[PDB]
């Protein structure tokens, strides 16, 4: 068919774009890291803990990931990486021995739909799996080496969701409190701090049934342990508060966009600012007070977006990426700012930066503390991308 023919032509195109992007990359990026992994990982996140060796530009950072394979055993993996804190040190910058590796492997079941570390102790993590039970692990107790027997030990795993799903959020203030979303259209809660030796499987402490559709995103307010919200395919998001009697009636509600929405992100600095993307090539934000009026909308993306995050150390920076194989950076301080015609033809003033250096679609992008100017990103092609923009754009 012509669609097959055009896709084959498209295969040539993406190779060309990567080649062209590679050609211009050094003059626009201050760092270029690339690594390919044996089996694709759906999501990735930085360990908050970091250490910088003395007299050594390369900084010790640790990343955690899952495993997605065709038919083999999947594993939960933690990998370390070294990145030059000082760029003045010119084996391009460091030794020829390499600056990236993997240290931790534990048998994983299915693929990691979503996994994060609980903030009060990053050692303990929870993982969304194709199975109904949400698995919980701590790499300290479990061996770093993979166990070839195939057995896994999801100690203190979480029950309460009937099926798998997407959406995970630990309470930033309450230890052991996390909200999980599922295809069951229900949001389940657990209290890990209160978990006894009940059998390493914890039933949902509280179950919410607000959204009519498959709830796919749910997150606590970054400042309030009481405030939290959920986002589903219903194109309608609803704000919730703890202990608020029935678990199906939200405190507030609003339809984010005209298409499905599965991405929510509060501003860590500004309490009121809450960023909301959408599948309709559109990203927006709302106010804790002004729910009826959209503050602003962003539509530079050429496809669905479902991953959004606020830049650390930078309240004015928000980023999002999706199936368009593009990553868009936006300046809140530049919303509507007058720009030369050579800028408007390039993009809106609020649009901070656009990155497209990956042949495959990227399913996750994550920055880390202590390094506000680098972003790790995971594409379908098993590629791990870390890059630093030029300081010139932000002076």
């Amino acid at each position: 068919k012509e669609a097959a023919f055009d896709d084959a032509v498209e295969e040539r195109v993406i190779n060309e774009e990567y080649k062209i992007w590679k050609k211009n990359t050094p003059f626009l990026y201050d760092l270029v890291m690339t690594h390919a992994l044996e089996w694709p990982s759906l999501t990735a996140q930085w360990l908050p803990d970091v250490t910088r060796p003395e007299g050594k530009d390369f900084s010790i950072h640790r990343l955690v990931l899952g495993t997605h394979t065709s038919d083999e055993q999947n594993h939960l993996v933690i990998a370390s990486v070294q990145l030059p804190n000082d760029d003045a040190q010119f084996g391009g910058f460091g030794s020829v021995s390499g600056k990236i590796e993997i240290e931790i492997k534990i048998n994983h079941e299915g693929e990691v739909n979503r996994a994060r570390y609980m903030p009060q102790n990053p050692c303990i993590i929870a993982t969304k799996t194709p199975s109904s039970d949400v698995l919980v692990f701590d790499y300290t107790k479990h061996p770093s080496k993979p166990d070839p027997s195939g057995e896994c030990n999801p100690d203190l795993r979480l029950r309460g969701h009937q099926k798998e799903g997407y959406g995970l959020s630990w309470n930033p203030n309450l230890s052991g409190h996390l909200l999980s979303a599922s295809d069951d259209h229900t949001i389940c809660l657990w209290d890990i701090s209160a978990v006894p030796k009940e059998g390493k499987v914890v039933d949902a402490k509280t179950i919410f049934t607000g959204h009519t559709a498959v709830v796919e995103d749910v997150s606590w307010h970054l400042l309030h342990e009481s405030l939290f919200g959920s986002v589903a395919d219903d194109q309608k998001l609803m704000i919730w508060d703890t202990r608020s009697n029935n678990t199906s009636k939200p405190s507030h509600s609003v339809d984010a966009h005209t298409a499905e929405v599965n991405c929510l992100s509060f501003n860590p600095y500004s309490e009121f600012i809450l960023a909301t993307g959408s599948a309709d090539k559109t990203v927006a934000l709302w106010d804790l007070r002004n729910l009826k009026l959209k503050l602003h909308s962003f539509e530079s993306h050429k496809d669905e977006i479902f991953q959004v995050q606020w830049s650390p150390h930078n309240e004015t920076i928000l980023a999002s990426s999706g199936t368009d194989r593009r990553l868009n950076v936006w300046d809140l301080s530049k919303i509507g700012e007058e720009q030369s015609p050579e800028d408007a033809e390039d993009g809106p003033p609020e649009l901070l930066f656009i990155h497209g250096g990956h042949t495959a679609k990227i399913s996750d992008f994550s920055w880390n503390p202590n390094e506000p100017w680098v972003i790790c990103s995971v594409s379908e092609d098993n590629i791990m991308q870390v890059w630093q923009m030029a300081e010139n754009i932000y002076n």
Binding site: D6, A8, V9, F90, G91, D324, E345
Partner: protein
């Protein structure tokens, strides 16, 4: 290595690494480009950066006053949403030129799907 010069330090003459492109796709793209210029005239009339829109009228609208209007329409059928214009500004809008940066969002795929293809093309997986 501190004295590491640019990336050019590789070799003098080595066998070619074989080109990824192909011929039969090249001709199809050219003819697709050729038939694209037959209507949009980017190369001939737009100088590779512009597209020509010739105006046609579908309906004639007359109000209570003398502000009789026409609904201008353009042949590519992927053009901007159809707008009402009056009789006075007929006959010079019969040739409208719009830059590529000014094209609407949906027109990106209407003119050519190959401009952007959603490679999965369907929900194989999340």
């Amino acid at each position: 290595n501190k004295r590491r010069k640019l990336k050019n330090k590789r070799r003098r003459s080595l066998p070619r690494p074989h080109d990824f492109f192909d011929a039969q796709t090249l001709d199809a793209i050219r003819h697709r480009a050729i038939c694209f210029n037959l209507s949009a005239h980017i190369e001939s009339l737009g100088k590779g950066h512009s597209v020509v829109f010739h105006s046609t009228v579908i309906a004639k609208r007359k109000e209570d006053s003398g502000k009789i209007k026409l609904l201008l329409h353009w042949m590519p059928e992927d053009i901007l949403p159809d707008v009402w214009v009056n009789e006075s500004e007929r006959h010079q809008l019969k040739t409208k030129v719009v830059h590529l940066s000014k094209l609407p969002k949906d027109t990106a795929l209407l003119l050519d799907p190959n401009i952007y293809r959603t490679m999965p093309q369907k929900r194989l997986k999340r």
